[PDB]
Design a protein around this nucleic acid. Structure first.
Lengths: 184, 186, 119, 130, 122
RNA sequence: GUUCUUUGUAAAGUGCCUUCGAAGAGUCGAGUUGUUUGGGAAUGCAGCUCUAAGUGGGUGGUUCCAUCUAAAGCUAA
RNA sequence: GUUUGACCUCAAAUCAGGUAGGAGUACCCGCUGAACUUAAGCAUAUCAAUAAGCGGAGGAAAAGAAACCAACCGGGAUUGCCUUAGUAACGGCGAGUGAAGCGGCAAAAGCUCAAAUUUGAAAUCUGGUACCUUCGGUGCCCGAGUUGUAAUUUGGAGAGGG
């Protein structure tokens, strides 16, 4: 068989991702949250979709069509920029910080799991920047945080913290050690 | 913020994380073309402090140049970085070279990531912070050394040390080598 | 002599096209009489007549195209302004007078005041 | 020359511009009081001392009330919106003048504004009304 | 006996003779007249400070400075941003260390503020 | 000059009180060959080796002192 | 689920819309770079950081708001002119090369990003498209974009409250 240039490059990059010995601040990724806990994290995170551009436009025209002719609490949503998440973390305004494992330059998000372990922020490296993108009206998100919450979802969030602490942080205490990628 | 973490991360270049990053990417850039376009900056922090805004009209090109130059030390006293900037200036002749930075290096090749603005793009022609590049006095700034590295290689700065090249070495030579004669002879 | 422009601006497309064919026949007949005689005066005036009719014909087409492309973006490259290359680039009056959001605040707060110094 | 030789020979015609007399005598534009009282036979600095006004604030290199009263004459010589007014109506009708209670109210003072902002805005409302 | 003649180079290419001395004086006076025709009631130049020259040689002499300071302008009773609109040159990098220079400048600013007539925006 | 629009709990500025508060890395530097300068102080630059710090760092001046804020960008006469 | 769907990267299209080349070249910004000559014959040196060659701009270009100068009773972006001044310094200390601060004057003008959360809300933008008072504006739609477009902030601090 004969493949294209770019196909050969991404296949070569795939086998290069495995066969090299890798520094332990990377490969701290790919030791990621399993299927049940990931689905359960999103069962909470899907309840806080940031109000999409169409929804925001129609509502704020509803404000105009009503209020100009003839009280609300602050609404809660997931928080999704890297400047803003690393702002929220270190201010301790973060209760659950979700980090993508696949980022275009890897160097972007390498400090973040260990800065979360430093601040005492209960983090989870979840699989897919696309999968984080879906819950946030963006193609990709790299990071998603949950600062404040409705009280109906509060107990579920606190348990999501404790499940992620037990499932992720306790199973992967060896991941701060051990250079990954020694696969023969 | 987030870029201070990035800035101080890329100051450690032989550190084991960035050692590994640079090992993979040097090989990956060899497999591509010499001058090719980058999807997005590899170092968005350094891109941004050199003035890359991630908006329509802003381009990142990745470039490769050979290293080095007593026949093997017949010098060629222009930089590798200015050579790179000029090559991307010719392949992308509709753009204007804003700035460039170092990304990865090697025995044979030094790599750069030039940043380019589209002066014909309407998202650049408005917004009064970047529409200065549309003025035709910036047609090929990289060809006349008006970029950061060009102004370095010209030796343009302030002081005693740059007296021979403060207004440009050709200008100051021509000025100081002129028999100025007045109507009423001084 | 010959045909006048202002007389032809009143005419339709079909009237001018028929006019043109008649002038081209007449000129074609005069080039056969030209070879027998030493000189012919009318051959010059009929040529300039054809030229005039074609100019009115082209003008009537062009202004019709100007009307169907009235007041919209992207009109034909010939119907656009010619000016010069360097001026058909170079920031438009809106894009040049466009000042940043910060400088407008600074200009309202502190405009260049007019003064006189003596009394 | 090469190009000038042809242009002085061609039937195109030169684009002759006689803008030399306009270089010396440029009309004063920015002030009609000065525009009426400016002797064009005099120079710039002579027309400044004739009027009285100082032309150069630094002492010059070299050797050096008729109108200023008219200037002095012409120099010696923000409402509220519908919703803002109706908002201040609500605050006054429910509270009156108790600014502590007025600013601790969640229902009317939705923007958690101070006492000074409230007394200033209400007095603007009271001056425009009775 | 000494003499040094710098005519070893191709000097005859770069010989500038200033025939336009009389032409360029007229040109600057026309420029001043134009600027004073556009800036009608205002002088032609910003109000410049009094300043002591550096070096043991010239520290006897008092000369024009670039601009005042934020300190001298504040002590006069106005702001730097507003001083520029009234045509007072402001120097951010200059420092105030001498009391006599300071007070001379403050009085130069104060007498300037008495003599001026600022036009309203209406 | 005359005239039509201005608005929204909108955008500023002054002085005081009160609480905080980052600053451009294969870059500076060091070595090194070559070029270059009036620059002996090693003047600038280029290549190659190696490669920093934040009560930082650079540049001057007889124990210290002074004065700048680099490695990002625009701007008439 | 052996299915379907997000992304990522890389392509193509006589796709929609744009843009680059060539000329001129006195001056201007770069790159590249000699020799005849002159030095006592002469590898340094000199002509010369010149001519030729190559690229790139405009009405000017470049430079420019200090990682500046100084040593004062301190000045204060650049550029240009007189002065410094054939001075300091360089050089078989040979032929020769050769400034700058200060002082005077011309002209003068200042600013902008990145780095600290809009997080009670991507407030931002391009294109398509229908109208209108068309160097544009408004409505709707596809997008770019959180790997960061907007507002605030640049040390002269600055910001949040009162």
């Amino acid at each position: 068989v004969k493949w294209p240039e770019y196909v050969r490059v991404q296949r070569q990059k795939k086998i290069l991702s495995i066969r090299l010995k890798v520094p332990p601040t990377i490969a701290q990724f790919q030791y990621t949250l399993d299927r049940n806990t990931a689905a359960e994290t999103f069962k909470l995170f899907n309840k806080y979709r940031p109000e999409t551009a169409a929804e925001k436009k129609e509502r704020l025209t509803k404000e105009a069509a009503a209020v100009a002719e003839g009280a609300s609490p602050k609404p809660y949503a997931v928080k999704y920029g890297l400047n803003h998440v690393v702002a929220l973390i270190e201010n301790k305004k973060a209760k659950l910080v979700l980090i993508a494992n696949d980022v275009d330059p890897i160097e972007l998000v390498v400090f973040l799991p260990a800065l979360c372990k430093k601040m005492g922020v209960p983090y989870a490296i979840v699989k897919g920047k696309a999968r984080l993108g879906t819950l946030v009206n963006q193609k990709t998100s790299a990071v998603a945080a949950l600062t404040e919450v409705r009280a109906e979802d509060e107990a579920a969030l606190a348990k999501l913290v404790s499940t992620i602490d037990a499932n992720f942080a306790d199973k992967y205490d060896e991941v701060k050690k051990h250079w990954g990628g020694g696969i023969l | 913020g987030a870029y201070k973490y990035l800035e101080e991360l890329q100051r450690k270049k032989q550190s084991d994380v960035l050692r590994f990053l640079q090992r993979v990417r040097v090989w990956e850039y060899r497999q591509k073309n010499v001058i090719h376009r980058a999807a997005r900056p590899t170092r968005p922090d350094k891109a941004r402090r050199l003035g890359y805004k991630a908006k329509q009209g802003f381009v990142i090109y990745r470039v490769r140049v050979r290293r080095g130059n007593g026949v093997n030390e017949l010098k060629y006293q222009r930089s590798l970085r200015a050579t790179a900037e000029e090559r991307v200036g010719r392949r992308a002749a509709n753009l204007r070279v804003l700035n460039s930075y170092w990304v990865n290096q090697d025995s044979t090749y030094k790599y750069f990531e030039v940043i380019l603005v589209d002066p014909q793009h309407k998202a650049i022609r408005r917004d009064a912070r970047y529409n200065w590049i549309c003025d035709p006095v910036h047609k090929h700034r990289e060809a006349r050394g008006l970029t950061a590295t060009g102004k370095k290689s010209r030796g343009i700065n302030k002081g005693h040390k740059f007296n021979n090249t403060k207004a440009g070495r050709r200008k100051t030579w021509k000025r100081q080598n002129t028999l100025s004669l007045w109507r009423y002879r001084k | 002599a010959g045909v006048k422009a202002y007389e032809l601006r009143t005419k339709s497309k079909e009237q001018l096209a028929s006019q043109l064919v008649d002038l081209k026949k007449e000129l074609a007949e005069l080039k056969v009489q030209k070879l027998s005689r030493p000189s012919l005066p009318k051959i010059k005036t009929v040529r300039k007549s054809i030229a005039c009719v074609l100019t009115v014909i082209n003008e009537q087409q062009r202004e019709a195209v100007r009307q169907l492309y009235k007041g919209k973006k992207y009109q034909p490259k010939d119907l656009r302004a010619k000016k010069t290359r360097a001026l058909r680039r170079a920031l438009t009056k809106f894009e040049a007078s466009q000042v940043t959001e910060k400088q407008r605040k600074k200009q309202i707060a502190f405009p260049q005041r007019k003064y006189a110094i003596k009394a | 020359s090469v190009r000038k030789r042809k242009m002085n020979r061609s039937s195109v015609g030169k684009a002759t511009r006689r803008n030399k007399d306009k270089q010396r005598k440029i009309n004063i534009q920015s002030n009609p009081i000065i525009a009426a009282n400016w002797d064009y036979s005099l120079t710039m600095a002579q027309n400044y001392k004739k009027l009285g006004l100082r032309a150069k604030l630094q002492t010059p290199a070299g050797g050096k009330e008729t109108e200023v009263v008219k200037k002095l004459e012409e120099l010696a010589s923000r409402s509220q919106s519908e919703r803002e007014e109706e908002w201040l109506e609500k605050l006054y009708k429910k509270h009156g003048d108790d600014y502590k209670k007025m600013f601790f109210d969640k229902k009317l003072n939705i923007y958690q504004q101070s006492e000074g902002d409230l007394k200033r805005r209400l007095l603007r409302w009271k001056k425009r009304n009775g | 006996p000494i003499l040094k003649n710098h005519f070893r180079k191709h000097w005859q290419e770069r010989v500038k003779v200033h025939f336009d001395q009389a032409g360029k004086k007229v040109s600057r006076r026309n420029a001043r007249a134009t600027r004073a025709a556009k800036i009608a009631p205002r002088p032609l130049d910003l109000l410049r400070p009094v300043v002591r020259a550096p070096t043991v040689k010239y520290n006897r002499k008092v000369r024009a400075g670039r601009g005042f300071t934020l300190a001298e302008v504040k002590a006069a009773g106005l702001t730097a941003a507003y001083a520029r609109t009234i045509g007072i040159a402001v120097d951010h990098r200059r420092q105030n260390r001498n009391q006599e220079i300071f007070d001379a400048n403050v009085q130069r600013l104060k007498e300037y503020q008495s003599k001026i007539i600022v036009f309203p925006r209406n």
